[PDB]
Paper text:
Comamonas testosteroni KF1 initiates isophthalate degradation through a specialized two-component enzyme system composed of isophthalate dioxygenase (IPDO) and its cognate reductase, isophthalate dioxygenase reductase. IPDO, a Rieske oxygenase (RO), catalyzes the initial and critical dihydroxylation of isophthalate, producing cis-3,4-diol isophthalate, thereby priming the molecule for further catabolism. Rieske oxygenases form a vast enzyme class—comprising over 70,000 members—known for their chemo-, regio-, and stereoselective oxidative transformations across diverse substrates. These enzymes catalyze mono- and dioxygenation reactions through a conserved catalytic scaffold consisting of a Rieske [2Fe-2S] cluster and a mononuclear non-heme iron center. Unlike related oxygenases, phthalate dioxygenase (α3α3) and terephthalate dioxygenase (α3β3), IPDO adopts a trimer (α3) architecture, with distinct active site residues tailored to isophthalate binding.
To identify the residues involved in isophthalate recognition, we co-crystallized IPDOKF1 with its substrate and determined the structure of the isophthalate-bound complex to 3.3 Å resolution. Although the resolution was relatively low, the electron density near the mononuclear iron site clearly accommodated the isophthalate molecule, which was unambiguously modeled with a real space correlation coefficient of 0.98. The backbone conformation in the IPDOKF1-isophthalate complex structure closely resembles that of the substrate-free IPDOKF1 (RMSD 0.585 Å over 419 Cα atoms). Substrate-induced changes are localized primarily to the active site, where H257 shifts by 1.2 Å to accommodate the carboxylate group of isophthalate. The isophthalate molecule is oriented in the active site such that its C3 and C4 carbon atoms are located at 4.6 and 4.7 Å distances from the mononuclear iron, respectively, consistent with earlier reported distance between mononuclear iron of phthalate dioxygenase and phthalate. Interestingly, residues R234 and H257 participate in salt bridge interactions with the C1 and C3 carboxyl groups of isophthalate, positioned at 3.2 and 3.0 Å from R234 and H257, respectively. Additionally, the C1 carboxylate forms hydrogen bonds with the side chain hydroxyl of T175 and the main chain carbonyl of G172 at distances of 3.0 and 3.1 Å, respectively. These interactions indicate that the carboxylate groups are key for substrate anchoring within the active site. Furthermore, residues I246 and I294 contribute hydrophobic contacts, while residue F333 engages in π-π stacking interactions with the isophthalate aromatic ring. The active site architecture, particularly the positioning of polar residues, restricts isophthalate to a fixed orientation, preventing alternative binding modes.
Numbering used by the authors:
A (entry chain A), B (entry chain A), C (entry chain A): -10 to 424
The structure:
């Protein structure tokens, strides 16, 4: 798809829309996204060895996640080869999962340890077992061909001490793309999060807010990096200066969000369960120090990008489709909430959810504010279509994801792009740039 | 479809069935029904200016209903042009709805007041905003081409003082047609409402009941009026006389039901939400006087054609799919209810619901009692197929809907058709004809 | 499909999979299974004459079951000919069901007793009424062409005194085939029922258990009988002897399970509601004596093959999709349950359910233990495809179903097949062979 149609940016065509949103096994985006380490499951889920196997579907592939006797977090297919029973009901023990029907056993790597019936027939029963690692507090799995297994991701929050990072998933009933797009559209922070930024503990009392809750019209400068796209979201800061909100889009699914002051750094990744559902991952980290108990609780409590859940055990958020996201029309009128939904993530996924599981890319009237998005789109669309032609994809090299976002006031003189070549090299080993 | 097959009346063919039941945007029935003012939403819903916008889907078009700051009940599409978020979460204020994501604002007429990003790009964002009026206590919207906007409907209950009319909607999980057909089939009143007519306050203690709960075999005389069809439902009244139940079918969806005695006048309209769902509207009015507090409460209480709802806020009736319509097999046996369902509307929609969202027009064995229906069918089918050929449709002129139904005892001598040319001219400005 | 592919048994092809699993009106399996008496409904459901008609869908045919005034359990179609209303809401009285809309009445045989509108038009309204009988405590209906109506089934539990038999249905959310396959795969009894056999009252404290909870690798000998297939499931019993578990598969859907000791005899039949749902029927009978109150309660209580239900009235089991079958991961670890599900049927249908409503016959890696299944498969597939060619099907003659299962210890010398020609003739009129 061309970058600009009729002077306005270009809506996605049919073919393109599906290139991107269809993420099933053996589809364009499917094959592309599989080449990257996939954030499967929190380690806190299978914390115990020989513990409850947990059903996780990633990229339209129903899978099962367990910690082998040895302490190895594994990911196998959920369905036994023998008669397609769920291995959920198998036995996680002796470094494998033995299915409950006729005793067939699966390695973490998904090999058939033991077939009671015909031991000769072990090699036929081999199921889909995919390798894993333990960065982030997240179990990362690799689903792309064995040979093109890349280096585990080295985002700052992957690498920093655990006490420095906080991670949550939230189940969101929409395709990954849209949900991600909300991370790469700072303009929305002006409107839908207008009042919430004052109230929330991760966004509050920072001079940036003044600038945000003012010039909503974000002019975007996109720089293509080998880690994805640098998004310089310009917003009239001071009469002499612009408040650039520099959000790093780490291809293909992780945002590193611009800081809000000294307050903890924030970030996301979007893991598509299928074509209509995604895992919305939020990470807060703090480079210099660890997370205060006060910070941690508040993140735990569902403040910030994190979200309170309906019941323990459920990654479905307390505010959801059913709940009307606790639409408080009082508060709408009382200018305590634009959307009428409180909570940061709730505000965001509510709108994302409302679009439908897949928005009508057809009827999208894209605007300026949508540069980030369009650029990321093409970037994805190229990669996938490219990978179709055997073109190795972008940002596989995890050393390059050694980066941080930024929020600086720059005189309208300084090209921000330049500024980040200068100021933002080795950016993890520097201070953070806030406000 | 021919009027009679094999001597019996004619079942609908495939093509015809869908002409009629498919009501989506840009389908035969869709285009036809759009030419008429559509009863969207009760005014009592958006009673307040700048109040909660209420999600209403009409004719398979998800729409949103609000009262602009000015007091103008509007109907806009539910989805923002920018990224297809629900405007539900927008802001009803300053004579528009400003979507919560990137601040785009919509006029009541559905124009883009303000696009923050690119003010130049306002005219691209124009969404579907459709005109409205305030008859009936119902917000009526016009969805057909701008030019073919007709005169607001002038049914007696539209025009009489509000204190004279009572209006309710009930959410019914079935296509509009069948649901409507129940209004144009007086024969059923004999069987399924047999005992309920004694118990209910709008039908009780009137000599008509004797006649109804006797000769269920209704012979129908249909007269085509320019307002739709006059249905003379003959039923052996007295040995010398017939009890004609004259139900006016006001094309395309409103029944004016024959009176039951001095008791309030009754009526319906069926607004199809989609191909499988409809809004079942019941109106009781009283021409000469206003509705007694005793009448009003009892109508409010869910007696008569009205229906008690599951919870406040919900237009889903208390008796529903789930509830088994409170099947009381005791009462069935105790001859307190034919169907086993109590309540008038409940009795009716239960059966209508049971057919399936769309009945199997294929396997319909139509009978005599089905004249009304078949005639109304063809009338519809012609109009739509006609409108396909650019043939302006029937009953657009709302002066002609200045009519009332009737229930008279006529010697078997008098042709009832004649009787209504004589007796039923200027019928609104007359007495009502009951029993 | 060939019996063996690549030395391993043969997975079902596409065409075959659907031959078997598609059971709708007028499909291969549909037509085949219709030729046999179908266990519709327990008599205990319509125990009363003129009682509540009960909605039952069999073989993808929504039907209605009532006991005519006379005491004749009937099965009619659920939908009225007039306008396709549910006859559920009709009146069971005067040896018929009179539909509630316009008073049309249906015979048990599904003839139109009385059409009020046009009495002439009675013969057009004839609906699907199918004959019935009262064996088992189950209402059996015949749905195949009138002429090919066979003899009511004469399984031992059909014929023995009622106090000798116990019957339950359990609603299982999966196609019939898989669910049935679990009856014809004794190998699973080793693994998934390992610990439950000790605990349960119908399986406990019998020397057979030792043998079962030992050699799970069942070698199968299948003998084709005219009643279906005799399945000699061999399992290393004693060093000198094999524990043959002889399960009779009575074509097309009834297992007679091998005994567990003196304990009551057990059996199943699978009635497909549609392509994705089935009625799982469990029968326990006792040939020599009637069922002890202690046996009966315990069967009633949901022990054995029977199952406790969520609420009274519901044939949905207490442990279900929602409940996670009360996965007790404690118990899994505590070796009180392999699967983690307690209860015999629960253990079984859980796994069956987990496969999906239809398992992925494509990805089935069949093993030795799957002889029974494969043989039964072909047998079915032949019959149906055969019936397609007008080839009258197997096991219609109910005298031949005068048979019982068996569990004998046979020296590894004795061919078990031979043994049953000798020992198992007139087997109903003999002792039972246990352990
Ligand atoms: O793009 C941003 O400015 C921003 C701010 C706060 C949260 C998020 C998010 O992606 O959740 C983005
Ligand atoms: O056609 C009729 O006689 C009748 C009577 C009562 C109610 C209704 C209805 O349309 O709801 C119709
Ligand atoms: O095949 C068997 O051994 C067996 C044992 C217990 C129950 C069942 C069943 O079909 O439910 C089968
Ligand atoms: S289905 Fe897993 S052991 Fe057979
Ligand atoms: S989606 Fe409505 S403001 Fe952008
Ligand atoms: S639908 Fe049954 S009486 Fe008409
Ligand atoms: Fe947001
Ligand atoms: Fe009715
Ligand atoms: Fe079993």
């Amino acid at each position: 798809e061309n970058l600009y149609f009729q002077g306005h940016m270009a809506s996605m065509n049919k073919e393109m829309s599906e290139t991107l949103t269809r993420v099933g096994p053996n589809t364009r985006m499917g094959n592309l996204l599989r080449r990257y380490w996939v954030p499967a499951l929190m380690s806190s889920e299978i914390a115990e060895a020989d513990g409850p196997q947990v059903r996780v579907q990633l990229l339209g592939e129903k899978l099962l996640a367990f910690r082998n006797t040895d302490g190895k977090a594994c990911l196998i297919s959920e369905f036994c080869s023998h008669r397609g029973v769920s291995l959920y009901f198998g036995r996680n023990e002796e470094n494998g999962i033995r299915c409950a029907y006729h005793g067939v056993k699966f390695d973490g790597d998904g090999q058939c340890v033991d077939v009671p019936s015909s031991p000769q027939s072990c090699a036929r029963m081999h199921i889909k077992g995919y390798p894993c690692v333990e960065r982030g507090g997240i179990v990362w799995t690799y689903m792309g061909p064995e040979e093109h297994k890349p280096s585990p991701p080295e985002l700052e929050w992957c690498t920093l001490p655990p006490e420095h990072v906080f991670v949550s998933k939230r189940l969101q009933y929409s395709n990954w793309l849209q949900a991600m797009e909300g991370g790469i559209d700072t303009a929305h922070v002006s409107y839908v999060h207008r009042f919430e930024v004052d109230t929330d503990p991760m966004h509050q009392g920072v001079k940036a807010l003044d600038y945000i809750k003012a010039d909503g019209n974000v002019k975007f400068e996109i720089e293509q990096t080998p880690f994805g796209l640098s998004l310089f979201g310009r917003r009239n800061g001071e009469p002499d200066s612009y408040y650039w909100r520099i959000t790093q889009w780490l291809f293909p699914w992780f945002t590193l969000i611009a800081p809000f002051g000294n307050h903890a750094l924030g970030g996301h990744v979007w893991v598509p369960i299928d074509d209509h559902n995604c895992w919305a991952w939020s990470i807060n980290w703090q480079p210099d120090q660890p997370l205060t108990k006060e910070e941690r609780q508040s993140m735990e409590e569902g403040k910030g990008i994190h979200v309170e859940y309906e019941e323990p055990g459920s990654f479905i958020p307390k505010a959801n489709r059913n709940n009307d996201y606790g639409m408080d029309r009082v508060a709408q009128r009382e200018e305590r909430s634009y959307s009428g939904i409180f909570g940061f993530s709730a505000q965001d996924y509510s709108l994302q959810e409302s679009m439908g599981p897949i928005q009508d890319h057809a009827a999208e009237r894209l605007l300026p504010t949508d540069k980030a998005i369009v650029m990321a789109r093409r970037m994805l669309n190229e990669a996938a279509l490219g990978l179709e032609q055997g073109e190795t994809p972008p940002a596989l090299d995890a050393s390059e994801q050694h980066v941080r976002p930024a929020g600086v006031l720059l005189p309208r003189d300084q090209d921000p792009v330049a500024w980040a070549r200068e100021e933002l090299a080795d950016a993890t080993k520097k201070p953070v740039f806030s406000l």
